[PDB]
Amino acid sequence: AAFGRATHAVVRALPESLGQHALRSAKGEEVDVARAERQHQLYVGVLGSKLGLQVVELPADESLPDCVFVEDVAVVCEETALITRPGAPSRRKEVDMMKEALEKLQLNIVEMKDENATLDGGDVLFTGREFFVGLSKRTNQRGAEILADTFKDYAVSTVPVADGLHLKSFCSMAGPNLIAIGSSESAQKALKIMQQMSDHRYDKLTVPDDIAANCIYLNIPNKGHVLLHRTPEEYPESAKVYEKLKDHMLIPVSMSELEKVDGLLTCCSVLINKK
Numbered sequence: 440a441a442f443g444r445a446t447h448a449v450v451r452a453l454p455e456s457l458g459q460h461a462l463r464s465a466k467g468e469e470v471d472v473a474r475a476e477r478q479h480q481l482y483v484g485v486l487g488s489k490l491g492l493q494v495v496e497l498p499a500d501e502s503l504p505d506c507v508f509v510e511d512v513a514v515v516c517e518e519t520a521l522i523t524r525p526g527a528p529s530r531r532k533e534v535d536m537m538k539e540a541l542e543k544l545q546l547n548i549v550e551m552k553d554e555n556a557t558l559d560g561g562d563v564l565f566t567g568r569e570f571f572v573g574l575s576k577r578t579n580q581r582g583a584e585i586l587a588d589t590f591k592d593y594a595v596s597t598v599p600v601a602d603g604l605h606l607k608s609f610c611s612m613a614g615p616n617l618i619a620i621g622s623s624e625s626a627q628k629a630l631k632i633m634q635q636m637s638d639h640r641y642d643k644l645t646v647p648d649d650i651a652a653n654c655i656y657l658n659i660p661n662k663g664h665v666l667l668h669r670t671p672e673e674y675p676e677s678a679k680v681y682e683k684l685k686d687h688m689l690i691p692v693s694m695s696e697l698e699k700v701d702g703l704l705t706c707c708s709v710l711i712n713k714k
């Protein structure tokens with residue numbers, strides 16, 4: 440029953456249409472869809488092959504350029520699964536194949552139908568003891584409330600998010616009571632507004648680069664602490680910090696191509712503890 444304990448992961452293959460048609464907050468370089476396919480296969484390979492997780496791998500839909508970012512379509516807590524209503528109208532038909540696959544895992548599904556409420560999963564931080572929900576261009580106040588009710592079991596608190604990002608675009612959990620946090624002003628501000636709002640003090644793992652604050656933390660059997668982090672070729676100074684976490688089974692994972700379209704590590708799966 441440890442924080443980070445998982446048995447299944449839900450992942451979705453990226454469509455060829457992601458190369459040219461995936462939403463991306465800024466203009467960047469060309470997407471090597473092949474390279475992004477490799478990088479995705481290596482991501483899924485760690486979770487399933489190396490870490491023993493049962494992986495649910497959904498088929499790529501071409502008409503949904505962003506289908507590979509499954510995090511944004513669902514939020515799982517305990518045995519309940521909140522099916523979101525993404526900020527991006529064009530992204531809502533990913534809900535459908537995720538819904539149907541969460542049904543095969545026997546999860547308690549609650550759907551966000553409220554035509555006014557929006558929520559991207561990436562805007563949701565779950566520390567194990569409460570919820571922090573980002574308010575952004577993808578997630579609204581009304582979306583936060585529906586989440587607050589689905590999991591009445593947990594305290595929800597909201598924090599304001601800048602630019603064209605998610606809350607987890609600069610943070611995530613690095614272990615039980617350890618939030619990975621970016622060094623930027625925007626990230627520090629966010630964290631401090633989160634700190635004041637809880638009846639608990641979280642330890643902080645501060646890293647130079649905000650994007651590299653987005654890692655995946657798992658507590659898998661016989662292994663203990665496991666952490667997938669952005670590779671040293673990508674963010675060397677951030678990898679330096681993780682490297683110090685000695686009781687953690689550090690796995691470097693590349694996400695350079697998908698990053699072009701604002702894809703980070705957490706975005707690409709939904710983690711599930713089936714007891």
Ligand SMILES: *[C@@](=[N])([C][C])[N][C][C][C][C]([N])C([O])=O
Binds near residue numbers: 505703
């Ligand atoms: C991750 N959860 C970051 C918080 N989601 C990134 C989604 C990127 C995608 N291209 C989109 O929705 O625009």
